């Protein structure tokens, strides 16, 4: 049976496992390594994808476009740190006008 299903995951454990060794990161990568990493990847994906989906609804749409990912990422204080020096193509900027104006 599937390593992705055995671990109760969506993200490809196998693929992640290939990338870990191909990458020449390690000499030999253990068994739980890709399953843990795959797990974290899926988690974060779900997280930003959730907040993004919310922003999509809040406007008026059903399809999530970059603007949503952007608005999503920038509004969560925690996610904003992680992707601090990241530029979302077609993400635009978070609406904001310095008070003093």
């Amino acid at each position: 049976k599937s390593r992705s299903s055995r671990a109760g995951l969506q993200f490809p454990v196998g693929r992640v496992h290939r990338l870990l060794r191909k990458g020449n990161y390690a000499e030999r990568v253990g068994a739980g390594a890709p399953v843990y990493l795959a797990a974290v990847l899926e988690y974060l994906t779900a997280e930003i994808l959730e907040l993004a989906g919310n922003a999509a609804r809040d406007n008026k749409k059903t399809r999530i476009i970059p603007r949503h990912l952007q608005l999503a990422i920038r509004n969560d204080e925690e996610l904003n740190k992680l992707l601090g020096k990241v530029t979302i193509a077609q993400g635009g900027v978070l609406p904001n006008i310095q008070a003093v104006l």
Partner: protein, 90 residues
């Protein structure tokens, strides 16, 4: 590249909200990015501790180091939950 999975995860979270190809492009960039980041630190941790193998214990510490505050706590939980199922679920 991850489009399959990220879509699979999407339906799981919002089973009625679609995603654009361009937005999918971004998601893929995100997945590869933090993968590169985490594996980089994991690899760094292993050399420091003169270990020739990247254990899940490195992925975890790497996750603690790179991810924010509480966002990191879940990622560890999720990973431990996931790793443990797989190991027991032979």
């Amino acid at each position: 590249s991850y489009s399959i999975y990220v879509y699979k995860v999407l339906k799981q979270v919002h089973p009625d909200t679609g995603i654009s190809s361009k937005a999918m492009s971004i998601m893929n960039s995100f997945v590869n990015d933090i993968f590169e980041r985490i594996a980089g630190e994991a690899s760094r941790l292993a050399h420091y501790n003169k270990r020739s193998t990247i254990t899940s214990r490195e992925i975890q510490t790497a996750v603690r180091l790179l991810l924010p505050g509480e966002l990191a706590k879940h990622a560890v939980s999720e990973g431990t939950k996931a790793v443990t199922k797989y190991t027991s679920s032979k």
